[PDB]
Design a protein around this ligand. Structure first.
Ligand SMILES: CO[C@@]1(C(=O)Nc2cncc3ccccc23)CCOc2c(F)cc(F)cc21
Ligand SMILES: CO[C@@]1(C(=O)Nc2cncc3ccccc23)CCOc2c(F)cc(F)cc21
Ligand SMILES: [Cl-]
Lengths: 298, 300
């Protein structure tokens, strides 16, 4: 029993964290095989012009107490790729994946190439992450683990004026309408990840919390009218299908759980909590709930 | 900026997780140097669980009864001893991934990371606090016994907890790495109940300082209070008494934010009286008590 916000074990990623220094800037890099990936703002803009002026010896790469030698440099979108002479012996089985809003991933927050913390979080529908990052955290990565394969999905680049965070996939493409330049940027109005709230309501039922359940069911169209009104993301037939296994395990049809969510949005919690929370949690996907309420290992 | 519940990176602990099998029971072990530590109840059958004589059950065991698996490699048990509720299995191979480590016993209110494992394989990492009633509110399924709680402060892993049991309310009980249980619990299936839980007051205050450091000030007030008056109010909301030690520990956060501890205590009193009124503090509608003053200064 119990339900916690749980991150993937970070060991496979810790063995890839390196420190990257160029000029006065120091941030984190991801050392995979003979390449170190890091935010291109470490050279800081005309990034092509700035990069052509740099030579390999300008980039100081440090893996533990060992300095790696840069033998090449190239740029792919907002990520800088520093070719090094040594392949990382600790390189796990990995792939670069771009995630969708609502999907969750674990973040290994680093400072000076040294991992300091791991937390679980979701790509908000406005493409920001509500992370916890200080100066020096740039280059920290977001990932998921599937069997023994690490899926790198995020690299930290910047903090928006509201304290929320913006970054790219490992191919340097930003999530959201953000740029890696000093300019006025604002995160759009955020919405709640509806499929994730429903998954978390199923986790609460699996843990014996049933007070919010009701005899009612709704149509998907009637629920989506309510979802729009309360700044909740639309629920698609895909989401309903993905929630299928949880619906089967708990005996509560997805549209039956939607009528519970609808009542919760219109009436509130009334001094009650769900899984120790007075708010509806939207940072557990349907897969996260199945994984935690079944015990899948890595 | 930003404030998250953050666990320590689990890599140093993952390299120590092994699977321990004795008869029909399989749970997790902690492989450090040439010793594997695990809950002593791995030697029990389900008919032994009510009133087990662990000394008597262990004397009947031999080294080859204990199957230890580190990855796809079986380790050979060359000795076994018991220290309180932990079983120590001497093995013929020192773990090459053994980090710099120490065994520390923690106090209620202290936080730590948990590497939840099943069959010697890590599946998740989360942040926990030792509750004032000596239980932990974990996320543990059957097979999680032997999963460990730890803190990583400067390359050294401090092992502080090993999971042993789930109480009828879904909360968890376990021991330090010397086998001494936290709380009045025993590793028997006899009727056991967690005492009434209370909120870790010093941790809530630390989290209110983190909220101020992050620019949230709506809950602050012009009032101060005496320590005794704060404790008389707080106890009525099932909050732990705040000692002069807690006030002293909050000193650095009080200095950084310019808000005296007894002034923050008055803001807490008011929050307890009024509730949040549809507002949140650091994205939470409840007062968070699983961030110590040390966690706040570290993260901020
Ligand atoms: C890399 O520096 C910047 C930054 O956001 N840094 C940060 C990233 N994370 C957490 C932070 C916590 C506190 C202080 C800064 C943080 C600030 C300067 O402007 C820029 C900029 F124009 C583009 C850019 F991609 C990054 C940055
Ligand atoms: C042998 O493990 C036991 C147990 O609690 N295990 C568990 C530990 N964690 C999460 C669990 C989730 C669901 C089911 C069991 C869980 C079984 C019950 O009896 C006992 C017992 F009297 C003493 C003991 F130290 C352990 C246990
Ligand atoms: Cl699923």
């Amino acid at each position: 029993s119990g339900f916690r916000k749980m991150a993937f074990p970070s060991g496979k990623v810790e063995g890839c964290m390196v420190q990257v220094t160029c000029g006065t800037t120091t941030l984190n890099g991801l050392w995979l095989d003979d390449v170190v990936y890091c935010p291109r703002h470490v050279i800081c803009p005309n990034y092509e012009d700035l990069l052509i002026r740099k030579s390999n010896h300008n980039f100081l790469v440090q893996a533990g107490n060992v300095q790696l030698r840069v033998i090449g440099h190239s740029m792919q979108n907002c990520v800088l790729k520093l070719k090094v002479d040594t392949a990382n012996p600790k390189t796990p089985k990995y792939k670069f994946v771009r995630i969708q809003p609502g999907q969750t991933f674990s973040v290994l927050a680093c400072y000076n190439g040294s991992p300091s913390g791991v937390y679980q979080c979701a790509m908000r529908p406005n493409f920001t992450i509500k992370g916890s990052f200080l100066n020096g955290s740039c280059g920290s990565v977001g990932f998921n683990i599937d069997y023994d394969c690490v899926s790198f999905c995020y690299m930290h680049h910047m903090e928006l004026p509201t304290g929320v965070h913006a970054g790219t996939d490992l191919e340097g493409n930003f999530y959201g309408p953000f740029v890696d330049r000093q300019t006025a940027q604002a995160a759009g109005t955020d919405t709640t990840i509806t499929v994730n709230v429903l998954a978390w309501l199923y986790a609460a039922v699996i843990n014996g919390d049933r007070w919010f359940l009701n005899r009612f069911t709704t149509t998907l169209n009637d629920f989506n009218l309510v979802a729009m009104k309360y700044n909740y993301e639309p629920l698609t037939q895909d989401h309903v299908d993905i929630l299928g296994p949880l619906s089967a395990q708990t005996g509560i049809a997805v549209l039956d759980m939607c009528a519970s969510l609808k009542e919760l949005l219109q009436n509130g919690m009334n001094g009650r909590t769900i899984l120790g929370s007075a708010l509806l949690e939207d940072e557990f996907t349907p897969f996260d709930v199945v994984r935690q309420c079944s015990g899948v290992t890595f």
